[PDB]
Amino acid sequence: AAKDVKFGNDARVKMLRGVNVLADAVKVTLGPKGRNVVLDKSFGAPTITKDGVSVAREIELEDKFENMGAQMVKEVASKANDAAGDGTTTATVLAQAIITEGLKAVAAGMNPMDLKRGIDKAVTAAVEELKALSVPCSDSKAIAQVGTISANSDETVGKLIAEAMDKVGKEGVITVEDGTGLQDELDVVEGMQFDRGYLSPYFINKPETGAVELESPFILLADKKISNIREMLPVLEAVAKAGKPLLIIAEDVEGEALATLVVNTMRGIVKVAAVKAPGFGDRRKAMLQDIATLTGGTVISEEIGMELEKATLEDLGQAKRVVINKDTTTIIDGVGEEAAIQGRVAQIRQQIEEATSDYDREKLQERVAKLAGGVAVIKVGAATEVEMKEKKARVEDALHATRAAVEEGVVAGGGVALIRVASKLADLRGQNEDQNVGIKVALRAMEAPLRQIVLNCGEEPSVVANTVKGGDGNYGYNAATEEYGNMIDMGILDPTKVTRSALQYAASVAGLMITTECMVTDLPK
């Protein structure tokens, strides 16, 4: 189709305008005195939310160029929330700040490529300063504290998370489910988690978490690329009886197969979800068997001459629950017999002895850690279904935060960490003046979050920011109480992972837009 092409400043201003609509819409929710955004549905009453992720999802602009701008920031900003479970809004606010001053510089005559390098250098330096400022989170006392803070000052949640990590470890897999009653429950069952997400966002049945949940599903394990639905009919019909969901773990699912599964599942004829098999090559084949042994199913390998048409319900494995998001898939409580699993774990441990390479042993040690490690299940209890679902949400959110805290620690929240690091990089310089400007652009951008939070509170941002710079360490401004002091002590903090991710992703998109000279899109026609 005929395209509309724009260049230089004309394109960059369009891109910026789009990012402003996105940022200006999400940044109203930032801080403890954040405002509400009303999202229309028409299929009912409008939604009122302070969740910047919810707002961002809805943002799409009519102007094709402006839209491209907003969609580029959204994409990258969302990755921050996927990594640490928070920071999408922060990343968006940072991106806006970097792009705004960045383009101003480009217009002044600065070299875009140098500006980018200046920014990137300021960021790498900022991340290093974040590590220095970071406070560890190791002992269970700390884990409980971070969990409590992340749970809106609920000591219960903090305790639950602490106990859960004490069973499966810090690197262990932890899941959250609905409670059976008032009492909370914690059990460790046979399960596994691998880094593979849904193959289509249309499988999502829990839009709130943006994940796919399957109750008592069958699991198909095929070591082939499924492209046609013809070979699936016999298995789909067998799953259509007994009325249970189906998880397809194959080398890949594409073409007609994927499409048909996407449609049929949305029509509600058969609940199905598909994900790629973990790893690649020989390792993929081996891990598919790990899943098989764990779920008590048999792998349908065309390599040995098996067909998918000859696949019976007996060939399918099964578990109690499956949780699939954009990046990970979690199998909970496999039907695999303890004898069979322990048997394969011992088999792999034998392979660790015969291992010649260190690499080979580390990869095997990873597979045994999954199979033997299991999965922790937290059943959140309450009086009332409403209270139960609500608490469950806080537990899931607090869990993600705590995990991130155990990885890289915690730093002052309220956007203090960023303005602190920025203040320590005043003497940072580059190879030329253009890069120097890029550095200053980034350092001034790191004040955006704090200033926005203060603004929402109705206080003078410049004054607060100026005072916070005066102090050192995790000294900052508690926007909630309007008191200065140690942010960590006051309980206002963020996982170092969150702040880091937000900044790095923000700078990623910002750097790309600053170095854009041409945009191509379709015509309004």
Residues annotated as binding site for ATP?
A: 29-32, 50, 86-90, 414, 478-480, 494
* DSSP per-residue string spanning 461-523: HHHHHHHHHHS-TTEEEETTTTEEEEHHHHT-EEEHHHHHHHHHHHHHHHHHHHT--EEEEE-
426 binds a copy of itself, rule: CB under 8 A: no
Interface residue with a copy of itself among 10, 171, 256, 390 (CB under 8 A) is 256
68 binds a copy of itself, rule: CB under 8 A: yes
Residue 361 CB burial class (10 angstroms; 0-12, 13-18, ≥19): middle
Region near a copy of itself per CB under 8 A, out of 72-80, 165-173, 418-426, 445-453: 72-80
204-243: which residues touch a copy of itself (CB under 8 A)? 215-216, 225, 227-228, 230-231, 240-243
From the list a copy of itself, Mg ion, none, partner contacted by residue 392 (C-beta under 5 to 8 A by kind): none
52 binds Mg ion, rule: CB under 5 A: no
Least distance between a copy of itself and beta carbon 478 (Å) = 15
Distance of alpha carbon 473 from alpha carbon 79, whole angstroms: 28
Which CB sits closer to a copy of itself, 401 or 446? 446
* DSSP per-residue string spanning 11-33: HHHHHHHHHHHHHHHHTTS-STT
Kindly calculate the radius of gyration of the chain based on its CA atoms and give it in whole angstroms.
25
Q: What is the dihedral of CA 67, 70, 75, 76, to 10 degrees?
A: 140
Q: Is 296 left (phi over 0), alpha (psi -120 to 50) or beta?
A: left
67 binds a copy of itself, rule: CB under 8 A: yes
Distance of alpha carbon 142 from alpha carbon 406, whole angstroms: 9
Least distance between a copy of itself and beta carbon 122 (Å) = 16
Angle (CA) 395-396-401 rounded to 5° is 95
84-123: which residues touch Mg ion (CB under 5 A)? 85-86
From the list Mg ion, a copy of itself, none, partner contacted by residue 429 (C-beta under 5 to 8 A by kind): none
Which CB sits closer to a copy of itself, 276 or 370? 276
70-89: which residues touch Mg ion (CB under 5 A)? 85-86
From the list a copy of itself, Mg ion, none, partner contacted by residue 227 (C-beta under 5 to 8 A by kind): a copy of itself
Closest C-alpha to 434, from 52, 77, 116, 3: 116
427-486: which residues touch a copy of itself (CB under 8 A)? 457-458, 460, 462-463, 466
Binding site per annotation, positions: 29-32, 50, 86-90, 414, 478-480, 494
Which CB sits closer to a copy of itself, 282 or 338? 282
Q: Which residue is nearest to Mg ion (CB)?
A: 85
Q: Which helix (H) or strand (E) holds 218?
A: strand 218-226
Interface residue with a copy of itself among 111, 295, 318, 474 (CB under 8 A) is 111
Residue 103 and residue 502 in contact, taking contact as beta carbons nearer than 8 Å: no
Interface residue with a copy of itself among 9, 46, 208, 489 (CB under 8 A) is 46
Backbone angles phi, psi at 360, to 5 degrees: -60, -40
CB-hemisphere CA count at 13 Å for 68? 18
Distance of alpha carbon 35 from alpha carbon 457, whole angstroms: 10
381-420: which residues touch Mg ion (CB under 5 A)? 397, 400
State both tokens at 63.
Answer: 């102007």
Q: How many residues bind a copy of itself (CB under 8 A)?
A: 97
Region near a copy of itself per CB under 8 A, out of 39-47, 166-174, 341-349, 398-406: 39-47
384-413: which residues touch a copy of itself (CB under 8 A)? 385, 388
Distance of alpha carbon 285 from alpha carbon 251, whole angstroms: 9
Residue numbers at the binding site for Mg ion (CB under 5 A): 85-86, 397, 400
